[PDB]
Structure formats: C-alpha cells, structure tokens
A paper describes a structure:
We used HEK293F cells which express [name] at the plasma membrane and form functional gap junctions. Both drugs inhibited the [name] HC activity and the GJC-mediated dye transfer. The primary mechanism of MFQ-mediated inhibition involves a conserved drug binding site deep within the pore of [name], Cx43 (this study) and Cx36 (a companion study). Mutagenesis of V37, a key residue located in the site M, renders [name] HCs and GJCs insensitive to MFQ-mediated inhibition.
Author numbering:
A (entry chain A), B (entry chain B), C (entry chain C), D (entry chain F), E (entry chain D), F (entry chain E): 1 to 108, 122 to 220
C-alpha cells in the first residue's frame, strides 16, 4: 500500500474536494474505523456476556438487556459508519462513471457540464453526510441521554418474577470509547459544515 | 483498490449497462452487502443463543425456534444476495467470454451480432434479477408477515411438556436491520424496473 | 480483481475448453463454493451443538449422531468440491507446463502433438469430473436417501441406557441448502455431459 | 511487500524527517504494534475470564473488575497507539495533499513556502506525538501506579455480600508485557525529544 | 493469482525438476494442504470436546486422551507437511540465491558448476523429502496401527478411580480423512521415487 | 508472491550478508514462524483449559498454573521471535535508509563509508541476534529445566485449601514442539556464530 494510491482511494478521485475533505476528514474517517474495529473486537465482544442480571430464571437477562439497549452502541456506530460511507462511495462511483463515459467518448463544451454536475453531486453528497451524522447524533442522544454508559440498572419485565438489578460489565471502558465516537462524529460534522460553506463561497467568488 | 478498477469490476465490464445499473444499483448492492455483513457479524450472531425458551427439558428450545423461524433472516438475505449476484456474475462472464473469443479471432459483421446478443443477455439478466428479488419478497412476506420481528412467542411442541413462552433477544435491532434490507431490496427492484424500461425505449428509439 | 484475469484463472488457461466449461460451469462452481461457505459458516456451524439428544448420560449424543450421520453434509460437499476441483487444477497445471516447456524450447510439428495431448488430457479431465460427481451423487443417496434431512430420530446405542429421541436443529434449513447442492451438482453433471459430447462431435467433424 | 515501499509507507513520504523518525522510531512503532497484537491475541484474551472472584452471587466479579481496572491495559495501549498514529497519519496526508496540489498546479517561489509549511506541520506533529505519549504515561501511572500488575485484590462492592478476594490470572505475564510497553513508549518519547531538538538546531544553523 | 506465476511459485523456479515434481506432486501437495485445512477447520476442531470420557472426576478425560493419542492426527500431518515443505523451500532458496549471485556477478565455466551443484542439491532435496515421508509413515503406523481410528476405548489411569470407557466423536469421519492423508502421502512417496530414478537415468544417459 | 521478491524481502536487501544469513537461517526463521503459528493455533490453544486442577474452590487452578508457568512456552517463543526479528528489521531499515539518502543525493568516496558502516551495522545486528537467542536459551532453561514439559504437578497455594494435583493436557505434544523450538533456536545460534566468524575472516583477508 503506497501513500499516493491510498490517498487516491480515500479521496474518491474527486478534483472538487479541497484539503478538508481529502485530508482531515479522511483521517477522521480512518480513526473512527479503527476505534470501531477495536470496540467490536474487544470492548463490545458479543455484548451479552458483558450484561449479567442477578437472576436464575432464564430469559429475564436477555429481555432486560433488550429493553435497556434497543440498539447496541458499537453496531449503531457501524450503521452510522456505513450510512456516512455511502455518500462518498456514491460520489466516487459518479466521478469514476464520468471517467468511463469520457474515455468511451474519446474513441468516438461537455466537459464544463460534467464538471458542474460533479460539483453539484459532491455538494449534495456532503449535505447527505452531514444530515446522516446529525440523525445519528439525535438517535444516540434519545437512546442514550448520558454520554457515559450506565453502570447498574433496575429492570422488571414479565419473565422476571420481580424487579432485579443488572450490571453492565465495562461502563467506564464503554464510556471512553463512546466519548471518542462522539468526538470523532462531532469533528466530522463540523468538517462537513466547513466543506459546505467553503464550496459555496468558492462558487460565489467564481461569479 | 482504485476507483476506476473497482467500478470496472462492479459494472461487469458491460457497455450496454447505463448509469442506473453501473452506479446506483451498484451502490445499493454494496450497501446491502455491508449491512448483511454487519447483521451476520453481530446482530444475528449464531442466532440460537439469542432465542431462549423458558424451559429446562432439552430440545424444546431448538424445535420451537425451528418452527417459528424456518429460515433465518440473515441467511435468507445471504441466499437472496447470492441469487441476485448470479445474473451479474453470469453476464459479466458472458461479456468476458466474447472478449476472449474476439481476441482469439483477431489473430486468425460479427461485431454487430455480438453486441445484439450481449444486449439480449443483459436484458434477461436484469429480468432474472427482478424475478429473484420479487420471489424473495414473497418468501420473506409469507415466512414473516410483519416487518418488525416478533418479540415474544408461545410454542407447544412434542418435546415441550406444555405450552411455553420463548423470547427473541433483539426484536428491535433485528427489526431495524430487516427494515434496511426491505428498503434496499425494494430500491433494487425499482432500479431493475427502470433499467428494463429504459433499455426497451432505447431499442424502440433505435428502430 | 479484474474480470479478464479472473476469467483467465477460472478457465484454466485452456484453449480447447468451449463456452460451457469456461462460463456456465465456472459460474456453477463459484455458486457451489459460495453456498458451501455459507453452509459451513452458519447453517452447519460445528454441527454438534445442532444435534441434541434427550439424555443425561454422557456419550450417547455423540455416538447417536455418528451412527445417523457417518459423514456430515457440508464436509461431504467440501470433499466433493475438492475432488471435482482436482481435475481442473491438474489440467491447468498441464497447459501451464506445456507453456513453460514451449517457452524453454523457444530459446533453444511439435505444436500439433502438444495441442492433441492437451485436448485428450482435457477430455479425460472432464470425464474424471463427471465420474467424481456421479460417485458423490451415489454416496449422498446411500448415506441420506431422502433429500430433506430428517428432523427427529430414534437411537439406541450401547452407552444409551435405552432408546432415546434426538433432534436435528435445522432440518428445514439444511434441507434448503441440500437442495441447492443437489441442483448445483446435477447442473454440473449435465454440463460435463454436454462438454464431453460437444468435444466428441467437434473431433468427428474435424475428420 | 518490498522494503523500499514499506519504508516509503512508514516514513510518511516526508523529506524533512531525518534518520531517527524514519528508521528507529519506525522500528519502535512496528515493535509496539506487534507486542500489542500478541497481548490482545493471547495474554489479554477477553480479559474477563482471566479475572476470577471467589464468590457465587452474580455481578460481584464484573463490578470488582471494573473498579480495579477502569481501563484495560491492552486497550489503553491500543488507544495510545491510535492517538500517536494520528499525527503521522495527518502529516502524511498533508505532504500527500501538497503532492496532489503541486501536480495539479503543474498542468496549469511557492515551493519554498510549501517546504516551510511542511516543516512546521511536521514539527507540531512530533510535538503532538510527544504530548500524547506523555499524557498516556501519566494516565497509566495514575490508573496503575506499580509497573507490575497486582496479583490478588480485595474488593467489597454493593452486589458483593461482603469483602471478597479476586485473582488476576497472569500478573507476571501481564507485568512482562507492561514492561515492554513502558520501555517502548519511553523510547518513543526520547526519540521524539531528539527529533524536536535536532530539527530546531537544523533551523537555527540554517539562519 | 495467475496460473503461470502460481506454477512458477510452486515449481520453486527450478529448471532441473521435470514434469512429475512440477505438476503431479505439486497437485498432490496442494490437495494435501486443502485436506489438512478442512480437517483442522471442522473434523479435528479442538479435538478435545470430540473425546468424551464417561466420568465425573476431573482430569481423567484429558489424561486418557493423552495416553491414547500421544500426537493428534491433524497436527502430525501438519508437522509432516512442514517437514516435507522444508526441502522444497530450501532448494527454491538455493536457486534464488544463485540467481542473485549470478545477477551480482553480471555487473562485475562457472555456469556449468552452478548447474551441477543445483542438480545435486535438488536430488538430495527429493531424497530428504522421501526420507521424511517414510519416517512419518512409520511414526503414524506405530502410533496408530489401524488406518481406521478406534471408536471406543478403555482407559484406567491414576486420576480415574477405575477403568472407564471413552468415545471418539467421529471415528468414521476421521477414518476417511486419514485414508486420504495416507493415500496422498503414499502417492507423494512414489512420485519422489520416480523423480529420483528419472534424474539418475538422465545423468547416466548424459555420460 | 514470487521467489525472487520473497528472497529479496527476507534477505533484508543487504549485500554484505552471505549465503548462510540469506538462505539457511532465513529458512530456519520461516520454519520457526510456522511451528510457532501451529503451536499457538492448536497445541497451546488458550493454554488454560489445557491445565486442569483437581479442585472445586475457584481460583486455585489459575494461581497454580501461574506459579508453575510464569511465562507460557508459546508466548515466550513469540517474544523470542520478535526480539530476534528486531535486528533484521532494524538493519533492513538501515540499508533502505542509505538507499533513500543515496537516491536523494544523486539528484543533488562517500560510498565506501556507506559500505563500511553498513557492514559494521550488520555485524552488530548479528551479534545482537546471537545475544538475544542465548538470553532466551537461559530464560527457557531456568523457567523450564527439563526439555520435556512436566505432565502432573503438585501445588499448594493460599486459595487452595490443601495440596492438590494438576494435569497438563498435552505434555507429550508440547514436548515435541518444545524440542523443535529448541533445535531451531540452537541452529539459529550456530548459524549466527558461523556468520560472525565468516565476516571477521573476510575483513581480515581484505587487509
Ligand atoms: C471523505 C472521505 C472520508 C471519503 C473516504 C471514502 C470511503 C467512504 C471509501 C474509500 C475506500 C472505500 C472502500 C473501497 C473498497 C471496498 C470493497 C468493497 O467490496 C466493500 C466496500 C469497500 C471497503 C469501500 C467502502 C467505502 C470506502 C472506505
Ligand atoms: C449490477 C451490479 C450490482 C453488478 C455487481 C456485480 C457483482 C454481482 C459481482 C462484482 C464482483 C464479483 C465478485 C468478483 C470475484 C469474486 C471471487 C470469487 O472467488 C467469488 C465470487 C466473487 C466475490 C464475485 C461475486 C460477484 C461480484 C460481487
Ligand atoms: C471448469 C472450471 C470450474 C475450472 C475452475 C478451476 C478451479 C478448479 C481452480 C481455478 C482457481 C484455482 C485456485 C487457484 C489458487 C489456489 C491457491 C492454492 O494455494 C490452493 C488452491 C487454489 C485455491 C486453487 C484451487 C483450484 C481453483 C479454484
Ligand atoms: C514516525 C512513524 C512511526 C510513522 C509511521 C506511520 C504510521 C502511523 C502509518 C504508516 C502506515 C499507516 C497505515 C496505512 C493504511 C492504513 C489503512 C486504513 O484503512 C487504516 C489505517 C492504516 C492501517 C494506516 C494507519 C497509520 C499507519 C500505520
Ligand atoms: C515440489 C513442490 C510440491 C514444491 C512446492 C513448494 C512449496 C513447498 C512452497 C511453494 C510456495 C511456498 C510458500 C511461499 C511463501 C510463504 C510465505 C512465508 O511467510 C511462509 C511460507 C510460505 C507459505 C511458503 C511455504 C513453502 C511453499 C508452499
Ligand atoms: C536473517 C533473516 C531471518 C532476516 C529475515 C527478516 C525478517 C526478520 C523480516 C523480513 C520481512 C519482515 C516483515 C515485513 C513486513 C512486516 C509488516 C509490518 O506491518 C509488521 C512487521 C512485518 C511482518 C515484518 C517483520 C520482520 C520480517 C519478517
């Protein structure tokens, strides 16, 4: 893996993307992937043996975990990663498609129109990224208000004969990784905002 | 991995495929693969320890799960993924075969016939994709009517001494991933419909 | 991975192989590998915790499973996959060897003899594939008469104090994958038959 | 993997980095990654079955481990690895970005300014690495004062009916790997200090 | 992976190796690796839960398994694979070393001596392979006289209070894979014998 | 993977290394890596369920294992592998660095000095390898005097109510792999000694 090719792959071979979206948010993307890989590997390993409920009747532990964790933190971040990777995947496919069409048309001004539609597609791609990041911020906030994961919980569900206390295995560890995910996502959000406004002022300065 | 080569691999080196089948449905295919990988990795992990039945006599839990889940969601999606990947795999092999035959014949108009049969093969390839997607829609509908997975079930099978209640571990989580699969498959269906009608009107406009 | 190189690898760089053996049976081979990978990954996972026997005395479950499943379905398919991959592996090594010998001899008609022996080697390679496929059809038939895997079994072995009932975890799921394996193998068989007769009529038409 | 390309990837294609930061601290980085991989693979495997508490009431073992190990050693080292990898990742993206901008501008003195800003960015990159390493030194010190991991601990938490004794599985083994991590991090720190002072005296000698 | 390069890698870039050692025994080597991978993956999985002893006192099962299986079948085959791979690894390094020395000397008859010593090194390489294969045949014979693995065993060791009966999980399955290993190793042996005699008669015909 | 490039990677692109250090000890290094991979994969799998103690009170088994196995055999070999890989890693980085410096200086006798310092660096690299190998020989000797691993042990630690007997799962198997590691390390030691004396007599013959 060479750095020039790796940067070429991460940048989505887009010429309209400036330094922020090809360097800093690319680094943020790689950092968030690495943290997610570590979290899935070790911290959130199977995420069920971590959650123990002080009970002997079967099924109470699973239903209590489901009630208090409707969507797991690591897999919510994985879905967030995929949903924010989709716009970059799409726009990279767009510029690659124009490369293929232009290469085909070479054997057989249009270039100005191609540049304009590529710019517009990239802009809405960043907008969709920002919207997806904001939606996952609100989803994470409503599911888990406190940034730090709760250590001990009280649950009383139908299979459970009475109210019981359940323990989260690594509330502090999962809190640290949650903080890194929240910080990385917030940085990605503000980088998207900077990208959007920077492109707008470039277009306004053009005219 | 470069974007030009990756697009070349995903497009199936087909010249008759237009923008929809080389860009948007390609992105949908990648998105569905990523969601399926996440679902198999974490949400549907072994899918048996997830399903607990409130009983002590052995064998009741397994048979109750088999009755209520004849085919697991994630592996049904995996079979759907393979069956819809097969037409693209086949047509890509077709155009590659014509490339090899034409390259062999170069050393030793036919090209018009090759283009015509490639167009027809690609059309029936998209038709077979659409039929496979529709069949899996009907199969998923009959096996699981409600889009949201049922949380708690009542089963009474021969090994079970009496009727017992069984709990699905993550009904909400599996519901979310089921919604994404249904939405992605529906998008793939309508993209196939658009591809079919677009090619038909192109051929009609040719004549 | 480019399509031209991937087709080149799958075709076994053989010029005497026609469209069937380089395109359709190649797709069938890939499809059977993918289904086998999925079956080993999830459906047949460790294939022992799937088989539960209603007993408490140790060793009865394992011996009952061994009696009713002398050779597991997925690993029987894996051995079938290897034994049918061996002829293609061998003939590809043959044509590669002739490439190396001809390249060595270039530095220092024989080509007609090389083409003839390559044709004969490829023919017996397809014949050996067809025989191996037929043998595994008969082996699978004798070991498992019904295509659908039995759901519940009755076993009485020496460690078992008396006759006990054992449950197969996913008889319907394993039935579906068995159907796909049987269909894929049958398609591979008839494709081999078509390849053999097609080459014979080509040679007869030559003379 | 060739040595020239691997060195090119590790050096971050930076011309202002001298021998220390491209050779010795690169080797230290690889060594720390390998030790971390081994520690996560085997020594710190799931790090929970390692920690056993002499009790039968559920939840006491997990909460006692959380209290005595707020952040696990291996994952703290993983976060340290990522946080010290981020500056090198960033500065490599910076020099790659200038390569792309200069290549784009070639088709259409600035080079002196580019060299100056690259030097400044690399300097603050090493400074941020040194600060991150020092912060993790202080974090590791406060969380775990003694370099050798404690073998046996006494915990008394609310779920635990009374004070109980818990055993760390491999205190000596984890001590050895902790010593290697501390030594490697300290070497990385002093290498960063040498890099900083060496660049400063180079700039002073320039003027 | 192209066939020409894969054959080049498997042949050990040796010009003195004829068709048998570059084609058939190469295929046998690949086949034995694939069977070993399958055996380690599934048939011999952890090979301890497979061996159950009808007892409750701990430690009797492990010591009984150790007595009746001093060296496991799959790992004995793995050691056999490595010990027979070592001569090919060594001789390939030899011919590569002569390539490097000749390339270095080009910048600055010896070639006849290089060819002669390469031939001798390859001959003793095949001899060492044959000896290693024969040794593992005798080792496997003495450890396990019968080719078919024993199904049920009687053991009485110090931890065991009295004589107990232990069950091998898959005696028939492990028998089938043992038969394939024995057949593949025997084929490799006779191929080595053919290689040795063929090279000898070539050298005698030269003089 | 081609043989020329693989040899180039293993040799550390060093011109002062003769046949022993580029061929035989390279093969020994690969052999030791393969044996270590097999040992970690299967023989030493998690190395805790292998060690069973005849007791019911929790924590006695873990502390008894820690006392009798302060450092596990496989991970001690892994640390030995890394510590002997470090000098080759370092010297390969050295020669690569001189390649980069010379390439940079080409655009802008020194070569004799570069060759001399490369020779000295390689010599001390082999010396450090030999010292590390000898240290691990002494460490392994003091931790485990007998080459064959002990089968049964007697331990009496504070958590254990009284003296108890513990069983090592595979003393014979681990003995065989220990013998291979000891033989491979000893061969690597004597190869280092031969390398050192050979280089010394070359330098003396030069002057
Ligand atoms: C603005 C920045 C962050 C854009 C970064 C682009 C990201 C989203 C792109 C760059 C490289 C891409 C990867 C390239 C190749 C593959 C292989 C495919 O089989 C699965 C998807 C996967 C793994 C892609 C996922 C999306 C990806 C990671
Ligand atoms: C219209 C769009 C979605 C077509 C996309 C083409 C898809 C179906 C094609 C593109 C690349 C293909 C992959 C290319 C190579 C391999 C390796 C082979 O050993 C298994 C199949 C596998 C993994 C192929 C599966 C089918 C595949 C994913
Ligand atoms: C007629 C058609 C189906 C022929 C298809 C050829 C098949 C049998 C060939 C094509 C590519 C081959 C693979 C190419 C490379 C390797 C790597 C080697 O280390 C193990 C075997 C393995 C994985 C081969 C197995 C056989 C293989 C899959
Ligand atoms: C001064 C020295 C230590 C600098 C060494 C540079 C390090 C920090 C650089 C060199 C190569 C880089 C790797 C190159 C490619 C990838 C793939 C990406 O998908 C995840 C990050 C990852 C794995 C990078 C992490 C950072 C990395 C390891
Ligand atoms: C006569 C025939 C069978 C010779 C076949 C040569 C065999 C023994 C050679 C060919 C390719 C070789 C492999 C090439 C590269 C590597 C990578 C290295 O990091 C571990 C060893 C390993 C995996 C080699 C093992 C030996 C090997 C498999
Ligand atoms: C004298 C002989 C034995 C020298 C052999 C050189 C050995 C020590 C060298 C040759 C190739 C090297 C590997 C090349 C690339 C990488 C990738 C990196 O991310 C981790 C280290 C790792 C895996 C290296 C470890 C050291 C290594 C194995």
């Amino acid at each position: 893996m060479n750095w020039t090719g790796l940067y070429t792959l991460l940048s989505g071979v887009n010429r309209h993307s400036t330094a922020i979206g090809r360097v800093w948010l690319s680094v943020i993307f790689i950092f968030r992937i690495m943290v997610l890989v570590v979290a899935a590997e070790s911290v959130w390993g199977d995420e069920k043996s971590s959650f123990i409920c002080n009970t002997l009747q079967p099924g109470c532990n699973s239903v209590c975990y489901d009630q208090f964790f409707p969507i797991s933190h690591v897999r919510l971040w994985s879905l967030q990663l995929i949903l924010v990777s989709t716009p970059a995947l799409l726009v990279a496919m767009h510029v690659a498609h124009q490369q293929h069409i232009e290469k085909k048309m070479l054997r057989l001004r249009h270039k100005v129109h191609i540049s304009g539609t590529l710019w517009w597609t990239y802009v809405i791609s960043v907008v969709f990224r920002l919207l997806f990041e904001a939606v996952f911020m609100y989803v994470f906030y409503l599911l888990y208000p406190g940034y730090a994961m709760v250590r001990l919980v009280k649950c009383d569900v139908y299979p459970c004969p009475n109210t019981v206390d359940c323990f989260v295995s690594r509330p502090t560890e999962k809190t640290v990784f949650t903080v890194f995910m929240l910080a990385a996502s917030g940085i990605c959000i503000i980088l998207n905002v900077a990208e959007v406004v920077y492109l707008i002022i470039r277009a306004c300065a053009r005219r």
